[PDB]
Amino acid sequence: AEVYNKDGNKLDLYGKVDGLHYFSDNKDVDGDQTYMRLGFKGETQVTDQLTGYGQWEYQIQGNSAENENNSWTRVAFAGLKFQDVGSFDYGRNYGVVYDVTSWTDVLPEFGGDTYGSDNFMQQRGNGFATYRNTDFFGLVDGLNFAVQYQGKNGNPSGEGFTSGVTNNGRDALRQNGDGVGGSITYDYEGFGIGGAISSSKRTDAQNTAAYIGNGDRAETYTGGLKYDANNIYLAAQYTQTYNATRVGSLGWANKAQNFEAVAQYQFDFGLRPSLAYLQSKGKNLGRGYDDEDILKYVDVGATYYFNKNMSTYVDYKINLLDDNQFTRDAGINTDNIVALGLVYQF
Amino acid sequence: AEVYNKDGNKLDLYGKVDGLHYFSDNKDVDGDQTYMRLGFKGETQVTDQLTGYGQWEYQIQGNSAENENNSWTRVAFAGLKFQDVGSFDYGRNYGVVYDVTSWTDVLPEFGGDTYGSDNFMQQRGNGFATYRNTDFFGLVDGLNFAVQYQGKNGNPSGEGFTSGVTNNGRDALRQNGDGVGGSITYDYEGFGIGGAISSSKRTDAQNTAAYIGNGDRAETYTGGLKYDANNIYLAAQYTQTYNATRVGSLGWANKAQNFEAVAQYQFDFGLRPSLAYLQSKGKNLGRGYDDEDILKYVDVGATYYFNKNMSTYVDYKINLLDDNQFTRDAGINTDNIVALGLVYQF
Amino acid sequence: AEVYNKDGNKLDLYGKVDGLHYFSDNKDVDGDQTYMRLGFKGETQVTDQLTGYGQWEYQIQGNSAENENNSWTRVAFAGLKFQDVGSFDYGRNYGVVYDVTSWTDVLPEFGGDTYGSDNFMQQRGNGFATYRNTDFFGLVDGLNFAVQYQGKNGNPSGEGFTSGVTNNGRDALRQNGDGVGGSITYDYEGFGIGGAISSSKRTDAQNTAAYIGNGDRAETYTGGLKYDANNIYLAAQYTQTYNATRVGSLGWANKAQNFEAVAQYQFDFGLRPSLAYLQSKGKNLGRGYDDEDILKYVDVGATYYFNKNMSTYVDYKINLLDDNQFTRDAGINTDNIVALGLVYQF
Numbered sequence A, B, C: 001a002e003v004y005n006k007d008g009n010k011l012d013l014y015g016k017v018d019g020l021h022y023f024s025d026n027k028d029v030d031g032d033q034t035y036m037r038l039g040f041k042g043e044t045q046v047t048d049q050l051t052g053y054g055q056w057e058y059q060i061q062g063n064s065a066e067n068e069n070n071s072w073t074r075v076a077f078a079g080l081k082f083q084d085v086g087s088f089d090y091g092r093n094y095g096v097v098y099d100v101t102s103w104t105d106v107l108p109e110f111g112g113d114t115y116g117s118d119n120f121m122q123q124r125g126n127g128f129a130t131y132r133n134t135d136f137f138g139l140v141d142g143l144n145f146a147v148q149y150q151g152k153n154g155n156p157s158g159e160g161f162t163s164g165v166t167n168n169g170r171d172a173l174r175q176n177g178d179g180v181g182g183s184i185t186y187d188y189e190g191f192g193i194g195g196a197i198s199s200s201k202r203t204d205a206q207n208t209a210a211y212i213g214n215g216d217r218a219e220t221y222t223g224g225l226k227y228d229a230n231n232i233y234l235a236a237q238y239t240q241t242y243n244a245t246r247v248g249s250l251g252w253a254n255k256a257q258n259f260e261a262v263a264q265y266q267f268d269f270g271l272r273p274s275l276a277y278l279q280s281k282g283k284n285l286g287r288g289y290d291d292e293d294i295l296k297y298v299d300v301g302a303t304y305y306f307n308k309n310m311s312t313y314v315d316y317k318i319n320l321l322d323d324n325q326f327t328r329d330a331g332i333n334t335d336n337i338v339a340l341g342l343v344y345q346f
Helices: A096-104 A325-330 B096-104 B325-331 C098-104 C325-330
Strands: A007-025 A034-047 A050-063 A071-082 A086-093 A127-133 A143-150 A179-188 A191-201 A215-227 A233-245 A251-265 A269-285 A291-305 A308-321 A336-346 B009-025 B036-047 B048-063 B072-081 B086-093 B125-133 B143-150 B179-188 B189-199 B219-229 B232-247 B251-265 B271-283 B291-305 B310-317 B339-343 C009-024 C035-045 C050-062 C070-082 C086-093 C125-133 C143-150 C178-190 C191-201 C216-231 C232-248 C251-265 C269-281 C291-305 C308-318 C335-345
Touching: A007 B048, A007 B072, A007 B086, A007 C335, A034 B072, A050 A086, A050 B072, A050 C009, A050 C335, A071 C035, A071 C335, A086 C009, A096 A179, A096 A191, A096 A215, A096 A233, A096 A251, A143 B048, A179 A215, A191 B310, A191 C035, A215 B291, A215 B310, A233 A269, A251 A291, A291 B271, A291 C070, A291 C086, A308 C125, A336 B048, A336 B072, B009 C050, B009 C086, B036 C070, B048 B086, B048 C070, B072 C335, B096 B179, B096 B219, B096 B232, B096 B251, B179 B219, B189 C050, B291 C050, B310 C308, B339 C070, C035 C070, C050 C086, C098 C216, C232 C269, C251 C291
Parallel strands: none
Antiparallel strands: A007 A034, A007 A336, A034 A050, A050 A071, A071 A086, A086 A127, A127 A143, A143 A179, A179 A191, A191 A215, A215 A233, A233 A251, A251 A269, A269 A291, A291 A308, A308 A336, B009 B036, B009 B339, B036 B048, B048 B072, B072 B086, B086 B125, B125 B143, B143 B179, B179 B189, B189 B219, B219 B232, B232 B251, B251 B271, B271 B291, B291 B310, B310 B339, C009 C035, C009 C335, C035 C050, C050 C070, C070 C086, C086 C125, C125 C143, C143 C178, C178 C191, C191 C216, C216 C232, C232 C251, C251 C269, C269 C291, C291 C308, C308 C335
């Protein structure tokens, strides 16, 4: 919670430590996943109508030995917020789509893995500019909508590259060009209807013949429904991506028609049994397959909260993906996983 | 100290900065050792009988240049604590043995180097599960005992390995298998008697012919005495490890019979002169030596506290190890060291 | 600001998040420069005349992807401060010269780039020992002067080196030997006159034939003037370095006669228009050039503060360096840059 509050500025340092264990026949994930997150969320009141804010979060891994450090900045964004107008921020922030897919991201640890960090515009990414209007400037409540842009993160500097070079370059699986997107959402009577659209130009370092799924731009459409009332949570979402969904290490997919569903219930003592189904179907991707789903699994779990600071979760990912050549080339999991976690948070 | 305390939860952010300098003829340690530690120790009261807690500490090095970062998570563990029953935690935590050897870890900077981080079960390590009972459920005070388990941390993923692979793999000198251990301690009238036992299965990546000291399991026994009264501190400890004591880079030792002693005195203004002797004898290790001690030195030092936040220490490690072929192969220090430190802590 | 204050010790955790964007034809800097800084500045009152303090700052980069972490410790120093005597600190701290050149370091993001971190003695560096006397032990106010020493940071350990090895070695462009320096400054009636002198022995790893500018020691002289009154800021500074000014990657320069000037004005609402000119002339360096300036540019910018926590700056670096062979060998920028930043700070 808030730790400093005086002279027109408040600042809370938040975070968590998660002692986590993965049990899987797939020895690439089996083991210990203990980690932590630490960050701050500061906000100042410039005037009775203008606000400023800065948030930052840093995830560190606690399962590595003493002689290596695994950690990364999840979010680091600064902006302003003018009342009944909206808020504008810049930095490394969440994607336009994430929010609606965040409706199906209420799992203990798994779930919402039809995308990853440093994807096109569908999760955490750098170079973001987001304008989020709340209540349509007061016409009606729970009618928010956002417009967002992102700049290019091309090839790294110093690696002999001569085209598509940016000071913060990276591997081609995580690069991107100039992209724009929007989102619209209405949440009333508990019922929530959300929609997102995004497009992003692709770089030449990604248009190579090694990575599959060549295309000019990446275009994502998402439509989702949600229901959160009387200790019940239901959510469904359907996304269609064109040249915008990763396929292991082989690159991306031409199309991807994934339909996610999740249902949870909150009991009067702190038990939350969750059931979430995910299927992401790759279609007309190429290389001889020309049709094969990227992901298919169910997740049955239970989270037990003792308060708003201490909790523990059990999770069971039943993977319904048989081992074939496409999976073995892409490196996509096919085994059932168990996740036992103990989370402290402040 | 505590910085946030309200709504049934308290959280203290603690740490220190240490401006340290090493003076040694061994140019591998001679130079600047300035560093810092930062972390949090949060605790919430679930019920009048059930507690939750989470601690985390991160050590960063301040003697490196601007273009590299040296740091690592020392401890990151979360658990619960039920009164007159005990506490159970998980994550990266301290070993079963450490506590009793912690009796001989009261030196300024040196001392307690018969083990290192990511050893078998004798210091900080990942994948820990520890149940510590206090006062034998109330029968008698100062009679605590702990039972602890640790899982395997095998070979890294993505390095072509096909056996003993875990998601948090590392080098073979720091791997381990499934291990279990216990400890029992009685501290009354200042007199403290402690004992620890630990065993750990070894992985096949460690059973190679390159690293010496092949064996099925690693077995450590420790017995120690302590005395802390009327501004006096005495401590002695004897450990015997089988296939569990590192020998530089060549692997481990078959046996190791180390006997540590330490004596310090606290004066009425803040002076603490410390004298600590360490000898760790490797026996029947192989490769032609078949008998040679791993470590032998004395440490004379003085710590001056100005308060509970600011202190400065002088330390003099007289190394009684002559330079032979075994040391030069293992990379074990043989020179006398001086350590001048200025420590601020909060 | 201060977050913990009780029992004779105070501690403030400070920092900032900066959403920054660089626009440049030089694709090595063009892109996103969003970053953050986090640290603590603790201080305890030992006696009514003796103080202890410890500061630490850590800069992390937020423009990198999820699978790499760019960060570094900027300052980490601990010391004591006896009233009307002075303060002594050790660790990674700022250089003797920086302060006077800090008079021309009042730019939004650019400026003060005639040196870099891990230079000889003119900015942040490790192994520092600084004694700063304030008011000449009370004879006259605003007459402070400092004496500072630094030890060697030679070659890294484990890289087959046999001479000039330190436990915290680095690349030869950032090494150094035993150096000493002093500084004297008088600030009265707003008028400030500052002067600094520094000398540093050079290591053999830097005396190679690959890096240009061979010489026994590095010697820097600096003289500067400042004026800060009635919402006006003027500053000028002249440095002459011998074997102490970096030249891209080719090593250093034999001489460097740089003359920096800056002028800013603070308006009654928060606008600060800044104009800063920098020229650093390399002379008699060798390799066939024998005369060529290291840097030459102007910077026109404007910073707008909304409070002491939220601000935003625009900056325009007009580079007056034409592209020749020397620049292309050294890797020195030649293009005009634009910098748009949004800074939140606590």
